[PDB]
Amino acid sequence: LSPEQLVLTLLEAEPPHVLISRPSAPFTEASMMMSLTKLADKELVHMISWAKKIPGFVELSLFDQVRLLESCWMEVLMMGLMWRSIDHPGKLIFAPDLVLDRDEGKCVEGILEIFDMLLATTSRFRELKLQHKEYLCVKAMILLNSSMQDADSSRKLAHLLNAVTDALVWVIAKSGISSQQQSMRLANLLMLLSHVRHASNKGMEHLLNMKCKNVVPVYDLLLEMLNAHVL
Amino acid sequence: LSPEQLVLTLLEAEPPHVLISRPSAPFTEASMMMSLTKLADKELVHMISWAKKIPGFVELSLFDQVRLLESCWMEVLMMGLMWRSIDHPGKLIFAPDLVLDRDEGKCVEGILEIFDMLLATTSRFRELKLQHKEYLCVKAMILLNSSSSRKLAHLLNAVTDALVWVIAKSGISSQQQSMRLANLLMLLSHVRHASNKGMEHLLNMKCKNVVPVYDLLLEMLNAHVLR
Amino acid sequence: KLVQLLTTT
Amino acid sequence: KLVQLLTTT
Numbered sequence: 220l221s222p223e224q225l226v227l228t229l230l231e232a233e234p235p236h237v238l239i240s241r242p243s244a245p246f247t248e249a250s251m252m253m254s255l256t257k258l259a260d261k262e263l264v265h266m267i268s269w270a271k272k273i274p275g276f277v278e279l280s281l282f283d284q285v286r287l288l289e290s291c292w293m294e295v296l297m298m299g300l301m302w303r304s305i306d307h308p309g310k311l312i313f314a315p316d317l318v319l320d321r322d323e324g325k326c327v328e329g330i331l332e333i334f335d336m337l338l339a340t341t342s343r344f345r346e347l348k349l350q351h352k353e354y355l356c357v358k359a360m361i362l363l364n365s366s367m368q369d370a371d372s373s374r375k376l377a378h379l380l381n382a383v384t385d386a387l388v389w390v391i392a393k394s395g396i397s398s399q400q401q402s403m404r405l406a407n408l409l410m411l412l413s414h415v416r417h418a419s420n421k422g423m424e425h426l427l428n429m430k431c432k433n434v435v436p437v438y439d440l441l442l443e444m445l446n447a448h449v450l
Numbered sequence: 451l452s453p454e455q456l457v458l459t460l461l462e463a464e465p466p467h468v469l470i471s472r473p474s475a476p477f478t479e480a481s482m483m484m485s486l487t488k489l490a491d492k493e494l495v496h497m498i499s500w501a502k503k504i505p506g507f508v509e510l511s512l513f514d515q516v517r518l519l520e521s522c523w524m525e526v527l528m529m530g531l532m533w534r535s536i537d538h539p540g541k542l543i544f545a546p547d548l549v550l551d552r553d554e555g556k557c558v559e560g561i562l563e564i565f566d567m568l569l570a571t572t573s574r575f576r577e578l579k580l581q582h583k584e585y586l587c588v589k590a591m592i593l594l595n596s597s598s599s600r601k602l603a604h605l606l607n608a609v610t611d612a613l614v615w616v617i618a619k620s621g622i623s624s625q626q627q628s629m630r631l632a633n634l635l636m637l638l639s640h641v642r643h644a645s646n647k648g649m650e651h652l653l654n655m656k657c658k659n660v661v662p663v664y665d666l667l668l669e670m671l672n673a674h675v676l677r
Numbered sequence: 678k679l680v681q682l683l684t685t686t
Numbered sequence: 687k688l689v690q691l692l693t694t695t
């Protein structure tokens with residue numbers, strides 16, 4: 220399967236656009252967190268089917284599919300937020316009916332920190348002019364490089380991760396820029412993964428505290444995806 | 451400043467190996483944390499000297515310098531560990547005389563897990579056969595990437611340019627150079643994760659009074675020196 | 678459940 | 687002090 224055809228499969232695995240069905244209106248600490256947990260829960264469902272459409276994912280042992288997803292879900296959600304927010308400086312496009320500002324994150328303690336991380340990383344991808352196909356490979360890579368018969372699944376994973384890496388290199392090569400510039404671009408995109416992982420670790424620590432306080436309705440899927448981490 | 455000059459400059463900037471002795475008796479929860487905290491404290495001092503030698507670092511504002519170091523210190527220490535442990539499967543060479551097996555990590559509640567990440571990541575670098583010059587560039591990239599703001603981006607590209615230059619001098623096909631560059635950088639996320647877990651663990655050991663946390667070490671732990 | 682969604686369609 | 691090492695040395 221050529222790099223271009225692998226990227227096409229990622230395009231076809233893209234989850235549908237999600238809305239929380241909230242009539243437009245100002246945000247409060249309650250409505251905001253409730254809207255975020257509600258959105259994360261909906262997205263997690265689509266994320267699982269997304270992962271299964273990635274060639275070879277379903278061939279990994281069940282132990283690996285679960286551990287990869289439990290490990291990377293938050294980062295994958297945030298990478299989606301960044302691609303969606305790219306054409307809208309200053310805003311975090313969590314969803315069409317869930318658009319927030321930096322000042323909106325002030326009502327909730329500890330979240331302004333997280334919004335700033337997300338906005339900064341988004342601003343970075345924006346100046347690099349992240350392309351849709353790059354976004355697709357990077358997101359797949361986050362899933363396949365997150366965690367870590369018995370040894371068989373292992374090679375399957377390395378093979379799959381290498382295949383998506385190969386696809387990202389291909390995408391960059393098609394931009395038709397200098398070879399040296401292709402290298403600088405690949406390194407610049409990958410170095411941002413560290414920042415997504417960081418915002419992710421902070422985002423989950425904050426959600427965890429919210430849960431322990433029972434201040435937010437933590438739906439079933441979101442709840443277990445969360446506890447798996449704590450575990 | 452050419453890539454080679456950058457690399458040569460980082461080579462010279464390498465910190466001397468910190469000499470810390472392994473406790474006489476077999477580790478106890480307390481003596482292990484004592485050794486790890488003292489080591490980190492001594493290494494942090496050399497890390498700052500090292501950082502000041504990275505081309506252009508001092509030209510950034512004091513505030514950016516402080517925030518880069520507060521944010522990446524543990525990651526940097528850990529990258530050094532992995533490099534030092536690369537030719538020693540199964541072992542973690544925290545220092546010349548502080549060689550730990552994964553087993554000893556049992557006397558400390560919750561550290562075995564961290565030792566696992568570290569050994570796992572070390573294995574990947576070993577498998578990729580990480581080279582000295584690559585290592586130098588990567589460690590510096592870790593510091594410059596834990597993000598004047600414009601000068602920082604240029605400094606980061608310069609070191610990246612250097613890393614690319616090193617990989618090309620290996621002579622592998624152009625397509626394989628891109629692939630190796632990706633394989634090496636994809637591991638930074640892992641180092642960052644292990645750092646997060648290591649700092650969270652250190653904080654807990656401090657709160658549980660399992661070990662005292664030094665002035666410098668504590669400032670770096672809290673990470674809000676500027677307030 | 679993560680597992681039931683990974684096993685059904 | 688982080689700031690000290692950075693500027694005093």
Ligand SMILES: Oc1ccc2nc(-c3cccc4c(O)cccc34)oc2c1
Pocket residue numbers: 255256258259262296297298299300313330333422423425426427429
């Ligand atoms: O597409 C996205 C992208 C990023 C997200 N972050 C959350 C999120 C959900 C629940 C609690 C949180 C929290 O307490 C802090 C920061 C983020 C959250 O949902 C998200 C959905």
Ligand SMILES: Oc1ccc2nc(-c3cccc4c(O)cccc34)oc2c1
Pocket residue numbers: 486487489490493527528529530531544561564647648649651652653655
């Ligand atoms: O050159 C190194 C490389 C890695 C290190 N990790 C520590 C460390 C220091 C203090 C507390 C810890 C902890 O609580 C968990 C894991 C690691 C630590 O010191 C280190 C020094």
